């Protein structure tokens, strides 16, 4: 995507919120931005916490959400304004309500502008609202999983990515990551015990996409073969892109 060093960028900590909903998204010497999200069906609720790290009160504290044209048609975001005055040492909360319309790839950008000590401060950070947040885990017996896996005929609906692992292959962490990703983590479906099989329905207003995922660790090459088989080619592609960056 964007070339150049990603430090002090709009996506420094973006990847950290694909499988978890709580934590600090951004922090400079004046402001700390924390998050707490909750999702259900094709909806979500993201609490954004703005902490004033100084002994001085912030003014004109202004957070705004920015979405590209395509993203607009696939994702709907709503939020109530927060008080523009933030006491030094104080923390203020903002709630963002989410509704997924259709599968999407782009991410919303949160822009924050405010005054401190009489100076204009500007921050832009990508908000971690990703397609997987709208997963309904679907537990199912092995037999049912394979029947569904073999119902795929359109080659474009299958997307495979073979990539190098970025983190250790710590089983419980990977399980937590997959569970955190959203789908159900089906136990004992793939005869290969090292493989992870997930099944879920990506819920969007306009279409429910049945998703089956197979994550095949390659311990030696420290790579994974991720296969997404879903009822929609673009969903297969995006879920593949996202999950790929997580291991």
């Amino acid at each position: 995507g964007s070339p150049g060093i990603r430090l002090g960028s709009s996506e420094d900590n973006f990847a950290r919120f694909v499988c978890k909903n709580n934590g600090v998204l951004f922090e400079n010497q004046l402001l700390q931005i924390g998050l707490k999200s909750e999702f259900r069906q094709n909806l979500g609720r993201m609490f954004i916490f703005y902490g004033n790290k100084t002994s001085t009160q912030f003014l004109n504290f202004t957070p705004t959400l920015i979405c590209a044209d395509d993203l607009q048609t696939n994702l709907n975001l709503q939020t109530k304004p927060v008080d523009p005055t933030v006491d030094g040492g104080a923390q203020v909360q903002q709630v963002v309500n989410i509704e997924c319309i259709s599968d999407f790839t782009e991410a919303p950008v949160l822009n924050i502008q405010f005054r401190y000590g009489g100076t204009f401060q500007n921050v832009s950070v990508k908000l971690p609202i990703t397609l997987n947040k709208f997963f309904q885990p679907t537990e199912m017996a092995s037999q049912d999983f394979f029947q569904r896996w073999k119902q795929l005929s359109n080659p474009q609906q299958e997307v495979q990515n073979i990539f190098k692992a970025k983190h250790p292959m710590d089983t419980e962490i990977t399980k937590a990551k997959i569970i955190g990703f959203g789908s159900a983590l089906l136990e004992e479906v793939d005869p290969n015990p090292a493989n992870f099989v997930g099944a879920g329905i990506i819920h969007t207003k306009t279409t429910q996409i049945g998703c089956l995922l197979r994550l095949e660790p390659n311990l030696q090459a420290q790579m994974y073969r991720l296969t997404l088989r879903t009822s929609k080619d673009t969903v297969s592609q995006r879920l593949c892109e996202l999950l790929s960056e997580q291991f």
Partner: peptide, 5 residues
Amino acid sequence: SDPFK
């Protein structure tokens, strides 16, 4: 053997 193909 492998139910994935």
